[PDB]
Amino acid sequence: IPTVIERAYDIYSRLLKDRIIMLGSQIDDNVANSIVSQLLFLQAQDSEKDIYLYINSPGGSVTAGFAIYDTIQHIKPDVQTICIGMAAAMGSFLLAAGAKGKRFALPNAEVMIHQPLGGAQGQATEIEIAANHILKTREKLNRILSERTGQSIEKIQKDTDRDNFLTAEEAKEYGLIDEVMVPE
Amino acid sequence: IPTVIERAYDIYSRLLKDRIIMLGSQIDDNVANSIVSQLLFLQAQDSEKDIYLYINSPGGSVTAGFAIYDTIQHIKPDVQTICIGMAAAMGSFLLAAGAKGKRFALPNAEVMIHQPLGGAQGQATEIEIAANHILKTREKLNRILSERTGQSIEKIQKDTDRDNFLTAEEAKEYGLIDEVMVPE
Amino acid sequence: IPTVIERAYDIYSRLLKDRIIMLGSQIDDNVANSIVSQLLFLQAQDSEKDIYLYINSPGGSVTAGFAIYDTIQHIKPDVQTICIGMAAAMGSFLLAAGAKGKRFALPNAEVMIHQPLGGAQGQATEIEIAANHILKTREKLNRILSERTGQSIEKIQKDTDRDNFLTAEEAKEYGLIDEVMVPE
Amino acid sequence: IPTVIERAYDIYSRLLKDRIIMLGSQIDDNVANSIVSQLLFLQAQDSEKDIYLYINSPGGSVTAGFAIYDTIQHIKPDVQTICIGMAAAMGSFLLAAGAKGKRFALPNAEVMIHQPLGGAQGQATEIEIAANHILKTREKLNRILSERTGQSIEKIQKDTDRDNFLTAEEAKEYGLIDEVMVPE
Amino acid sequence: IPTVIERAYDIYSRLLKDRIIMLGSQIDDNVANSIVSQLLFLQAQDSEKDIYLYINSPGGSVTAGFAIYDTIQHIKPDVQTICIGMAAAMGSFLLAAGAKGKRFALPNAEVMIHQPLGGAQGQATEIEIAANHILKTREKLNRILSERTGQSIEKIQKDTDRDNFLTAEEAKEYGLIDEVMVPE
Amino acid sequence: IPTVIERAYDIYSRLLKDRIIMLGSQIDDNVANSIVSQLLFLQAQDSEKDIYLYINSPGGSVTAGFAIYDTIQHIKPDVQTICIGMAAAMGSFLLAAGAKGKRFALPNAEVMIHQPLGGAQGQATEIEIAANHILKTREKLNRILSERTGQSIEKIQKDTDRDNFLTAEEAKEYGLIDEVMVPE
Amino acid sequence: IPTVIERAYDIYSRLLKDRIIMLGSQIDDNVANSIVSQLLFLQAQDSEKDIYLYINSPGGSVTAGFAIYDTIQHIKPDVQTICIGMAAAMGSFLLAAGAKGKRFALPNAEVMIHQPLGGAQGQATEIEIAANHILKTREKLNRILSERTGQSIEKIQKDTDRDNFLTAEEAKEYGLIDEVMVPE
Amino acid sequence: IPTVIERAYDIYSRLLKDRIIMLGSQIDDNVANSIVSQLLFLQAQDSEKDIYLYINSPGGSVTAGFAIYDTIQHIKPDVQTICIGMAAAMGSFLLAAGAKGKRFALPNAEVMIHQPLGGAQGQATEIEIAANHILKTREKLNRILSERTGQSIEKIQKDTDRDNFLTAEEAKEYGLIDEVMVPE
Amino acid sequence: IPTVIERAYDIYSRLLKDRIIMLGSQIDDNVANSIVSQLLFLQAQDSEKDIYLYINSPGGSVTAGFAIYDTIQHIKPDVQTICIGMAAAMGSFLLAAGAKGKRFALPNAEVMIHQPLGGAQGQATEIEIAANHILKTREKLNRILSERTGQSIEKIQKDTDRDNFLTAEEAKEYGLIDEVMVPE
Amino acid sequence: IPTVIERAYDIYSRLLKDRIIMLGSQIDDNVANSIVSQLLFLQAQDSEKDIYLYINSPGGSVTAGFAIYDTIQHIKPDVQTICIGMAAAMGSFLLAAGAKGKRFALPNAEVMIHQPLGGAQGQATEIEIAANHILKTREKLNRILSERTGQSIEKIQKDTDRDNFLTAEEAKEYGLIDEVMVPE
Amino acid sequence: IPTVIERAYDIYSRLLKDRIIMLGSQIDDNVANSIVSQLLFLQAQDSEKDIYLYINSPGGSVTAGFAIYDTIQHIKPDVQTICIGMAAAMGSFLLAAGAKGKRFALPNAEVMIHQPLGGAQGQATEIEIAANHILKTREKLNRILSERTGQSIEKIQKDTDRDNFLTAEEAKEYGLIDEVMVPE
């Protein structure tokens, strides 16, 4: 909303100039499309200086999440992830997707992990196709999460059966983040 | 709707007196509950004289259908099934469930068979449970249909993949009915 | 709506006692189910004395109509058809379905014939299936109409491409009715 | 609404016993169907004693009106028509359709005549068919009205171009009624 | 819906005369009130001759179910339970509540068990109260179910975590029913 | 819903003949008005033989409840109260209002007590008047409840601050009922 | 809304130039995302000169509030908090989170504290998870509030059971603010 | 809406340059937030030259009003208030809040004072809290009004019981304004 | 949404300066019209340097898709296609439409192919026209897909009968893409 | 949507600078008013250099279409028409209206021709006026189409009776376009 | 919609620079306000050089029309009117209001004239007032139209009784326009 002088920016654009990206909403195709564009742009500016991705998100579309995830992995700069407020579902997935050693959460931020949600309507055959797809998506999520937390696929499976709320400390213990940023 | 004298009946009740049951609507728990009750009543009246079930139905709930199906098989009297207009989905299933040799259709009546429809919302686990259930329901339907038409399970599976519209002649050929009642 | 004494009837029931059936509405599964029931009941009462079906109807469900059509052909008594007001679409089909020599229309009654309407939603394959089904239903209707009017299938096809309004005299000329009842 | 003893009637049924029919609503297929049924019933009871049709109606379906009209002409008993309140559009058409010499109005009743209303949606071809039909219906209405009032088709055409409100005296002068019933 | 002569009954009341009760809908306060009232009436008629409760129900209100359950246990007559179609959730609970040795299902009937569903809105304190209540209700349900199936509380808890669909044979194996009524 | 023969009743009327009243719904003016009428009628029939009031109710209007409460106290017959399913709020108030020594609950019935709910919209002065009224209503309820359970006003006040769920045993311990009817 | 010249600003941006942030709305993810961004930007500009946060807010999302809270604590500059109008719920939480000695309220500003609100729908297990989470969230809030006011956890718990409205003086007395700014 | 050149302004901004603020709408949190910001900005520009607040408002949120009121009293410049059109409820409150000797109304402007409005939903306890809060708010309003008009608290209480419409002269007589600006 | 300095751009425009186009939404006439314009503009800028089209789309209008497809083939520069997130239906069609050797997907991107969806309402003749058109469209799509993947028309037809979800690797194996971009 | 630098343009304006006009939407009075303005402006710039009109449109208002049509014929520069995606109804009319020899379609673009659609509500007289108007409009359209394609009026009449889908090649064969632009 | 460079304009403003006004919408108070303003502006710029008013309008408010009409007559420059597409009702009124000798239509443009439309609700006296006013407005319209076309008031009255559609040639013959602009 508010504007800054230098030429005129909105507050987010001003921060973007310092290689900061704010994710402050649910993740859908628009948000993903914006985040990805910001990442590509920041790389084209300087492919050495690393990027800061603040995350306060309830989650959202799994494929939209992957567009962000893959883009983070694909670019040269390290992307630091900093969780403020809440990082849930696909949000926490992205939190854990920051460059290793540079994934943070503020002391009172919360992390939640759980299985993906979906739906299927129609013929038995169609429902089967949808069910297979969502189960396959869960495997893919769990696999990549296993790699980035160091937890086994079996433990992830069990821990994400229902909503699982984690404190910043517990999140660190789990391997979703590296450090909880103690007040300076 | 209209009334007959003898004591006063509505037209359907009057026909019930002659052991005739009209199925003229979609199949849901109320309809099943009424059809089942009529069947049990008719048996208590006379367990020898057979029963006439006219069927003009687009189908409906699979479990509500099975209430009717199982009740037909469970009582002593033979239940003749006569398709007028249309017998689709669970409706055609019930057509096929009449006493062997006594399943009829009028010359211009239509029969349609296809796979069951359903839906699943929520977690991956939840969707899987629903998917398994509807696929299991399809096997059950196909198995019972195989027994009453004499067609193989494999053929039924292929033939019900999409909407399959059958003429009265084709329905006899298929083994869903025994005879097409030629005008007297 | 109104009641008659003898025991108490509604006006339609009173007329049913004289073997008169009123069709005064669009044709759907409920209406068909009731008309069919009346026909079956009337035959059980006396299978010789013929039946009077007055028709004032804009049409409706093709399958519902066939339930009626087939039942008329199936029972022993002749069913006279008498068109008052309007007999359109499936309504004029049934007008033409009365016993030969006993299909009437009052002088200012109207008849309208046209092709069947429908709809299809979804995948290309599904639309195809629906399209084939409605084309096949049209052939069925045209064939039967051909038989009852004496007009060729080709002429019927052409004449029902769009809405075709006929006067009582034109309907007689076409072979949909036999006589126009001149005022007594 | 209210009930009378003798066996139990509703008020309209009690009056039907005296060969009185009440038309107190707009004319549609249900209403027609009921009025027609009453007429046929009354004839079957006694084909000599004449019938009283009270009319208070804003009009309605032209075809539904013709069902009534043609039925009045077709039966043996004279039908007196007595306008109370308002007889408009198809309503006034029916008022004029009573047996000659026996078409009445009460002193403060109103009559209104005007052209038929309708609609057409779709392709140019479709609109043309609809336009032709409604113009033909207007000719039909004007022709019959000419016959019953004694006014020329050209005068009727001009007088019904817009809404035309008539007093009871003016209605008599026009030939829609024979007598205005002066208070006894 | 339909009527039987003897005096006039509706089909359900006619069956009630033979000590049969139909449960054909979801269970709520109205349904319970009715079922309870039936049971009380049947007992007052004869406290020896046992009662037949047909069940085809998706379930519903837990407390409404308990009104039924407790009334079954409270009256003198044995209450046979016969599952037709589907008995799910509180439905299957009532199925299992029949007199021991007299709990049946038809061959293609389905049974489903799962945990109770609820909701809580408002302050943290309020949500806690609601959570405690529903957990307590679960214990109550599992405890009584344990008693009637012979399965341990721990196994019930695990088996009802998600939707659990059972065939008639599986239901008997589980101890929800005693016999699957083979077609006679 | 269902009908019984003797002359024809609905099930509830048949039970009313045995002095049994079913309360199976929320309590509002209509329900109160009906229960009150049933009580007055039963008294007029026989002022000695006591009455049975089954209660499965989530509660409802406080004043409607009092109409019932006061009528119970005002009539000569003892009114037994039997809780099946759930008696909450004004429901449990009525439960406790039965003749002392004859207030029962079935083993798995639930009781819930809590403070009354309301609303006020408008001017400060208006809101004050509403607030005073609802607080005065709470005192009245607590006072009467104190008298019938033997618990102190202060204890009631504290125990009804939030929703308070009670088992049948707990309800007996509290003094809301006298006995829990163990299965016969 | 309005614009200021210097280059063009909206009024809020103009104030942001002087290190003033306006919180004039309910707190959600957008608002948090903006406030946080403003804070980060202000720090990058000058990490010594302190920041002014005006608060007129009814509250909102607890996690969104924490994103703000943690950011305030994380940055170098002191953040003064000044309550104008109303600071309620998470609003008053943030008011109390300003740098010690620099938390103000205007003389007629109001503060309101109460427990967090939430909801849970679904299975007993799911409701339990939600209940536990909100109860934990309350502990977290009470703990941090205890630290910043100097009141014991037990007192906070009691004082936030229901809505608790405080004047500016009472808020200072409570330790939510340090000073009430007397008119200059 | 319209734009002025100098650099481009909207009309309001152009006036803001001359230290004029327009309040032309109902008072809510946005409006207050904007007015407050304008006030703070104007002071930062020049803390001597006084400020013009034109008021045409039906009133609105009491707390939003107090954010404006307190900011007026807190800043150094005098704030002149000029009522054009209508100043009602919180609107007239703010009118009376301008610097003494500099509160104006145009000759035909209207002022209306009345008590505050609100609402309370829920438990008796909850309604009581809300009632107390709104009564306390009314005292606060009345007290501050008494101070600025010179009328006793008792007189204000009586005069604001219902809607009280005042002419500009009557408003001056009451002490809400100092002068009515006679046309120049 | 956010802004960049150099002159002021939005983030997408900034990327367009580097010949990058973002497709991050469903495909309709507006989106196509924008994408086409971007392509034409980029060619007028430089007809040698190739273009980057990122694709994260659920698909959409087939004709709108073809506007893009044809424009890609029509312009001189090579158009690289890079799938991030999901490319489904017409989305995946466009993916496969990039310059050969320059069609990519990120490791966790998904591709889905299936037949086109549509609808038909109205007369039999009209439905037939619609059915023919959509079948013809499917042939067109399969044919072009066959050319770009190197798979046979027959295999495409079978593979697209229902929803077919593909991993990045599977998509490469199919011939939809050339390379999966491994993290750098 | 996106912006280009040089001074700042939106992408369409940038293309307008090169005498390109995009028609990407249905045709109504706004769209027409814009396209017309663009044509007039482009002429005032340079009356020799010809203009490029890209067309992807489902059609729309016939009179709006004529505003565009007539303006194309009225200005000096040749207007090239290029169909991308789809040109239906009035869309395809405008496609055919480009300067002879300069009417193009991309290889997979579709063209559709059919009769105009409309509606008429009201009196018979009113419907007749509407019907005449739309028939006259069809003649006008067919006439002008005849002139530009070289097909006879009678052929156009027949070919546009229903929806008529054409490929790019077929469109060329028909004389709607001159060339199909083969990929360069 | 689109933008032109010189300083930046929208297309309409660019054309306004050349003294061209586009009327491409229904006429209401906004549209009138805008057109009027453009006229006053153009006059202030140069009161000699004449103005071009293009008209494609279905009509609208009669008083809004008159604001435009009177403004045209009041200003010094000649206003040419050019009808493109359609000029109906108040649209055609304005077309005829252009400077004599400078009222044009393009060859395929349509003109339609008819009486004004309105409505009146309420008391007999209120309806009378409305009726008188709309009749007086018709006289006013007809009188002015008479003056500008040279047709008599009686002919106008007759010709506008119903919708009257005119071709460009017919319009010229009627005197609504002077010339039809043949393609250059």
CB-CB contact of E66 with F108 (8 Å): yes
Question: In this complex, is the C-beta atom of I180 within 8 Å of any C-beta atom belonging to chain A?
Answer: no
SS3 B58: coil
- Where does residue K45 fall: left (phi above 0), alpha (psi -120 to 50 degrees), or beta otherwise? alpha
Among residues E110, E95, E177, E183, the alpha carbon closest in space to that of B136 is found at E110
**Residue E18 per-residue DSSP state:** T
Among residues C138, C136, C147, C135, the alpha carbon closest in space to that of C176 is found at C147
Interior CA angle at E57 toward E54 and E60, to 5°? 130
CB-CB contact of D77 with D126 (8 Å): no
- What number of other Cβ atoms are within 10 A of residue E43's Cβ? 17
Question: In this complex, is the C-beta atom of J101 within 8 Å of any C-beta atom belonging to chain D?
Answer: no
CB distance F183–E71 less than 8 Å? no
Q: How far apart are CA A23 and CA K26, in angstroms?
A: 45
**Which residues on chain H are in Cβ contact (under 8 Å) with F123?**
114-117
Q: How far apart are CA A167 and CA E149, in angstroms?
A: 42
3-state helix, strand, coil in chain H (%, to 5): 45, 25, 30
How far is the CA of D104 from the CAs of D12, D50, D86, D95, I64, in angstroms? 20, 15, 12, 8, 68
CB distance J85–I73 less than 8 Å? no
CB distance I118–C135 less than 8 Å? no
Which chains does chain H touch, 3 or more C-beta pairs < 8 A?
Answer: F, G
Q: How far apart are CA I136 and CA I118, in angstroms?
A: 12
Q: How far apart are CA D104 and CA J160, in angstroms?
A: 55
Number of domains in chain H: 1
CB-CB contact of J166 with J174 (8 Å): yes
Question: In this complex, is the C-beta atom of K44 within 8 Å of any C-beta atom belonging to chain J?
Answer: no
Q: Which residue of F has its CA nearest to H129?
A: F131
CB distance G70–A24 less than 8 Å? no
Question: In this complex, is the C-beta atom of K160 within 8 Å of any C-beta atom belonging to chain J?
Answer: no
CB-CB contact of C130 with I118 (8 Å): no
Among residues E86, E149, E73, E148, the alpha carbon closest in space to that of E112 is found at E86
What is the sign of the dihedral through the CA atoms of D80, D83, D84 and D90?
A: positive
CB distance A9–I3 less than 8 Å? yes
Beta strands in chain B (DSSP E): 3-5, 8-10, 20-23, 51-57, 79-88, 103-105, 110-113, 117-123, 164-166, 179-180
**Which residues on chain E are in Cβ contact (under 8 Å) with F168?**
none
CB distance J120–D138 less than 8 Å? no
**Which residues on chain E are in Cβ contact (under 8 Å) with F20?**
40
User: What is the per-residue burial (b if ≥16 Cβ within 10 Å, else e) of B146-163?
Assistant: bebbebeeeebbebbbbb
Non-local CB neighbours of E56 within 8 Å, separated by 6+ positions: B29, B32, B33, B36, B63, B64, B67, E23, E24, E83, E84, E85, E86, E87, E91
Q: Which residue of J has its CA nearest to K83?
A: J67
Non-local CB neighbours of H2 within 8 Å, separated by 6+ positions: H10, H11
CB-CB contact of J168 with J55 (8 Å): no
Q: How far apart are CA D71 and CA D41, in angstroms?
A: 12
CB distance C117–I131 less than 8 Å? no
Question: In this complex, is the C-beta atom of F144 within 8 Å of any C-beta atom belonging to chain E?
Answer: no
Of H118, H124, H138, the CB nearest to F115: H124
Interior CA angle at C68 toward C67 and C70, to 5°? 70
- What number of other Cβ atoms are within 10 A of residue C45's Cβ? 14
User: What is the per-residue burial (b if ≥16 Cβ within 10 Å, else e) of C75-96?
Assistant: bebbbbbbbbbbbbbbbbbbbb
CA distance I89 to chain A (A): 15
CA distance H174 to chain G (A): 23
Residue numbers preceding breaks in chain J (C to N > 2.5 A): 6
Non-local CB neighbours of A143 within 8 Å, separated by 6+ positions: A153
Among residues B72, B140, B93, B37, the alpha carbon closest in space to that of E168 is found at B140
- Where does residue G64 fall: left (phi above 0), alpha (psi -120 to 50 degrees), or beta otherwise? alpha
Residue numbers preceding breaks in chain A (C to N > 2.5 A): 6
CB-CB contact of E88 with E56 (8 Å): no
**Which residues on chain J are in Cβ contact (under 8 Å) with K163?**
126, 129-130, 133
Rounded to 10°, the helix C62-74/C29-45 angle is: 10
Beta strand pairing call for B110-113 and B164-166: antiparallel
Residue numbers preceding breaks in chain D (C to N > 2.5 A): 6
CB distance J106–I70 less than 8 Å? yes
Question: In this complex, is the C-beta atom of B3 within 8 Å of any C-beta atom belonging to chain C?
Answer: yes
**Which residues on chain F are in Cβ contact (under 8 Å) with H117?**
122-124
**DSSP structure string for chain I:** --EEE--EEEHHHHHHTTTEEEE-S-B-HHHHHHHHHHHHHHHHH-SSS-EEEEEEE--B-HHHHHHHHHHHHHSSS-EEEEEEEEEETHHHHHHTTSPTT-EEE-TT-EEEE---EEEEEEEHHHHHHHHHHHHHHHHHHHHHHHHHH---HHHHHHHTSS-EEEEHHHHHHHTS-SEE----
Question: In this complex, is the C-beta atom of C3 within 8 Å of any C-beta atom belonging to chain B?
Answer: no
Of H38, H74, H140, the CB nearest to G11: H38
Of C119, C121, C128, the CB nearest to I135: C128
CB distance E3–B13 less than 8 Å? yes
Beta strand pairing call for B117-123 and A117-123: antiparallel
E and D in touch (3+ CB pairs within 8 angstroms): no
Q: How far apart are CA C54 and CA D36, in angstroms?
A: 10
In single-letter form, the type of residue at position H181 comes to M
CB distance D127–J118 less than 8 Å? yes
In single-letter form, the type of residue at position I40 comes to L
CB distance B66–E108 less than 8 Å? yes
Q: Which residue of E has its CA nearest to G161?
A: E125
How far is the CA of G138 from the CAs of E127, G128, H45, H122, in angstroms? 12, 15, 44, 22
H62 sits in which H/E element: helix H62-74
Q: How far apart are CA K138 and CA K134, in angstroms?
A: 6
CB-CB contact of I146 with I156 (8 Å): yes
User: What is the per-residue burial (b if ≥16 Cβ within 10 Å, else e) of C163-181?
Assistant: bbbbbbeebbebebbbebb
CB-CB contact of D71 with C84 (8 Å): yes
Non-local CB neighbours of C40 within 8 Å, separated by 6+ positions: B15, B20, C71, C75
Q: How far apart are CA D179 and CA E8, in angstroms?
A: 52
CB distance F56–E129 less than 8 Å? no
Q: How far apart are CA H68 and CA H59, in angstroms?
A: 12
**Which residues on chain B are in Cβ contact (under 8 Å) with A134?**
124, 127-128
Interior CA angle at I81 toward I78 and A100, to 5°? 130
Structure tokens at F72: 């119970």
CA distance D20 to chain J (A): 34
**Residue H183 per-residue DSSP state:** -
Q: Which residue of A has its CA nearest to G4?
A: A3
Q: How far apart are CA A140 and CA A132, in angstroms?
A: 12
Deposited resolution, Å: 2.8
CB-CB contact of H96 with H103 (8 Å): yes
SS3 K20: strand
Bridge partners for H60 per DSSP: H27
Counting every residue written for chain K, the total comes to 184
What is the sign of the dihedral through the CA atoms of H144, H145, H148 and H150?
A: negative
List the single best residue of A113, A114, A121, A134 to mutate versus B (max B Cβ within 10 A).
Answer: A134
- What number of other Cβ atoms are within 10 A of residue A184's Cβ? 7
List the single best residue of H133, H134, H158, H159 to mutate versus F (max F Cβ within 10 A).
Answer: H134
Bridge partners for B54 per DSSP: B22, B82
Q: How far apart are CA H178 and CA H171, in angstroms?
A: 9
Beta strands in H124-178 (DSSP E): 164-167
CB-CB contact of G134 with E124 (8 Å): yes
Q: How far apart are CA E14 and CA E2, in angstroms?
A: 10
What CATH code is carried by the domain that includes residue I66?
A: 3.90.226.10
Of E32, E38, E144, the CB nearest to F56: E32
- What number of other Cβ atoms are within 10 A of residue D54's Cβ? 19
What is the sign of the dihedral through the CA atoms of J114, J115, J116 and J120?
A: negative
Structure tokens at G26: 């309910």
Q: How far apart are CA C82 and CA C89, in angstroms?
A: 15
A84 sits in which H/E element: strand A79-88
Structure tokens at A110: 């919360």
**Residue B27 per-residue DSSP state:** B
CA distance G106 to chain E (A): 29
Question: In this complex, is the C-beta atom of G128 within 8 Å of any C-beta atom belonging to chain E?
Answer: yes
Structure tokens at H177: 């304004």
Question: In this complex, is the C-beta atom of B41 within 8 Å of any C-beta atom belonging to chain C?
Answer: no
SS3 E146: helix
**Which residues on chain A are in Cβ contact (under 8 Å) with I183?**
73-74
Bridge partners for D104 per DSSP: D82, D179
D and J in touch (3+ CB pairs within 8 angstroms): yes
Query: What is the domain range of residue C150?
Result: 1-184
